[PDB]
Amino acid sequence: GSSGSSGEIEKGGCGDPGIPAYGKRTGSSFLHGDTLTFECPAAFELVGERVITCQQNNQWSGNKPSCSGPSSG
């Protein structure tokens, strides 16, 4: 392995899309280029964008997901 890129600078971030009341989110922090994923327990099916990606435009590509649906097996 070898050295990499350097440089220290402050960055903004999409915003505070909050957390859904149907599942759990991973990544309380939201930076430019960060991906926020979600998950739902049993007796629930993913109903939306499993994981979104910031657009460095004070906005998100999609809204928070959801949880609703029967079992699988």
PDB file of C-alpha atoms in Angstrom, residues 5-63:
ATOM      1  CA  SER A   5      -5.261  11.923  -0.874  1.00  0.00           C
ATOM      2  CA  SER A   6      -4.922  14.725   1.676  1.00  0.00           C
ATOM      3  CA  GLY A   7      -6.731  17.929   2.591  1.00  0.00           C
ATOM      4  CA  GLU A   8      -8.842  19.193   5.483  1.00  0.00           C
ATOM      5  CA  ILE A   9     -12.043  21.114   4.756  1.00  0.00           C
ATOM      6  CA  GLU A  10     -15.469  21.555   6.344  1.00  0.00           C
ATOM      7  CA  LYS A  11     -18.538  20.155   4.587  1.00  0.00           C
ATOM      8  CA  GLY A  12     -22.244  20.862   4.979  1.00  0.00           C
ATOM      9  CA  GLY A  13     -24.722  18.033   4.547  1.00  0.00           C
ATOM     10  CA  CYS A  14     -28.157  17.162   3.185  1.00  0.00           C
ATOM     11  CA  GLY A  15     -30.064  17.881   6.383  1.00  0.00           C
ATOM     12  CA  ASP A  16     -32.190  16.239   9.065  1.00  0.00           C
ATOM     13  CA  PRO A  17     -34.520  13.765   7.304  1.00  0.00           C
ATOM     14  CA  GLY A  18     -35.386  12.436  10.748  1.00  0.00           C
ATOM     15  CA  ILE A  19     -36.051   8.768  11.458  1.00  0.00           C
ATOM     16  CA  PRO A  20     -39.085   6.653  10.473  1.00  0.00           C
ATOM     17  CA  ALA A  21     -41.394   5.236  13.143  1.00  0.00           C
ATOM     18  CA  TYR A  22     -41.533   1.861  11.398  1.00  0.00           C
ATOM     19  CA  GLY A  23     -37.906   0.759  11.347  1.00  0.00           C
ATOM     20  CA  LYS A  24     -34.387   1.591  12.504  1.00  0.00           C
ATOM     21  CA  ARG A  25     -31.860   3.867  10.800  1.00  0.00           C
ATOM     22  CA  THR A  26     -28.061   3.668  10.778  1.00  0.00           C
ATOM     23  CA  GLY A  27     -26.089   6.906  10.687  1.00  0.00           C
ATOM     24  CA  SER A  28     -27.455   9.732  12.824  1.00  0.00           C
ATOM     25  CA  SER A  29     -24.921  11.938  11.041  1.00  0.00           C
ATOM     26  CA  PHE A  30     -25.562  13.161   7.497  1.00  0.00           C
ATOM     27  CA  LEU A  31     -22.615  14.354   5.408  1.00  0.00           C
ATOM     28  CA  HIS A  32     -22.015  14.983   1.704  1.00  0.00           C
ATOM     29  CA  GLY A  33     -21.708  11.486   0.272  1.00  0.00           C
ATOM     30  CA  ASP A  34     -23.080   9.565   3.245  1.00  0.00           C
ATOM     31  CA  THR A  35     -25.602   6.759   2.770  1.00  0.00           C
ATOM     32  CA  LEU A  36     -28.481   6.241   5.202  1.00  0.00           C
ATOM     33  CA  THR A  37     -29.815   2.683   5.371  1.00  0.00           C
ATOM     34  CA  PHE A  38     -32.816   1.247   7.215  1.00  0.00           C
ATOM     35  CA  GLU A  39     -34.178  -2.083   8.445  1.00  0.00           C
ATOM     36  CA  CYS A  40     -37.411  -3.664   9.677  1.00  0.00           C
ATOM     37  CA  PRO A  41     -38.102  -6.527  12.121  1.00  0.00           C
ATOM     38  CA  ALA A  42     -40.167  -9.655  11.475  1.00  0.00           C
ATOM     39  CA  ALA A  43     -43.748  -9.527  10.199  1.00  0.00           C
ATOM     40  CA  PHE A  44     -42.786  -6.508   8.094  1.00  0.00           C
ATOM     41  CA  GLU A  45     -41.762  -5.884   4.484  1.00  0.00           C
ATOM     42  CA  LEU A  46     -39.636  -3.040   3.118  1.00  0.00           C
ATOM     43  CA  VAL A  47     -41.873  -0.407   1.530  1.00  0.00           C
ATOM     44  CA  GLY A  48     -39.591   2.188  -0.028  1.00  0.00           C
ATOM     45  CA  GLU A  49     -35.976   3.087  -0.761  1.00  0.00           C
ATOM     46  CA  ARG A  50     -33.912   0.644   1.298  1.00  0.00           C
ATOM     47  CA  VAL A  51     -30.973   3.058   1.217  1.00  0.00           C
ATOM     48  CA  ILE A  52     -30.675   6.612  -0.099  1.00  0.00           C
ATOM     49  CA  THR A  53     -27.684   8.769  -1.032  1.00  0.00           C
ATOM     50  CA  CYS A  54     -27.165  12.459  -0.270  1.00  0.00           C
ATOM     51  CA  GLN A  55     -27.181  14.837  -3.238  1.00  0.00           C
ATOM     52  CA  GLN A  56     -25.035  17.584  -1.715  1.00  0.00           C
ATOM     53  CA  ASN A  57     -28.056  19.759  -2.493  1.00  0.00           C
ATOM     54  CA  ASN A  58     -29.546  20.190   0.981  1.00  0.00           C
ATOM     55  CA  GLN A  59     -31.922  17.402  -0.043  1.00  0.00           C
ATOM     56  CA  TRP A  60     -32.196  13.623  -0.376  1.00  0.00           C
ATOM     57  CA  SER A  61     -32.748  11.555  -3.521  1.00  0.00           C
ATOM     58  CA  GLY A  62     -35.705   9.891  -1.829  1.00  0.00           C
ATOM     59  CA  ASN A  63     -37.854   9.991   1.298  1.00  0.00           C
TER      60      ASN A  63
END
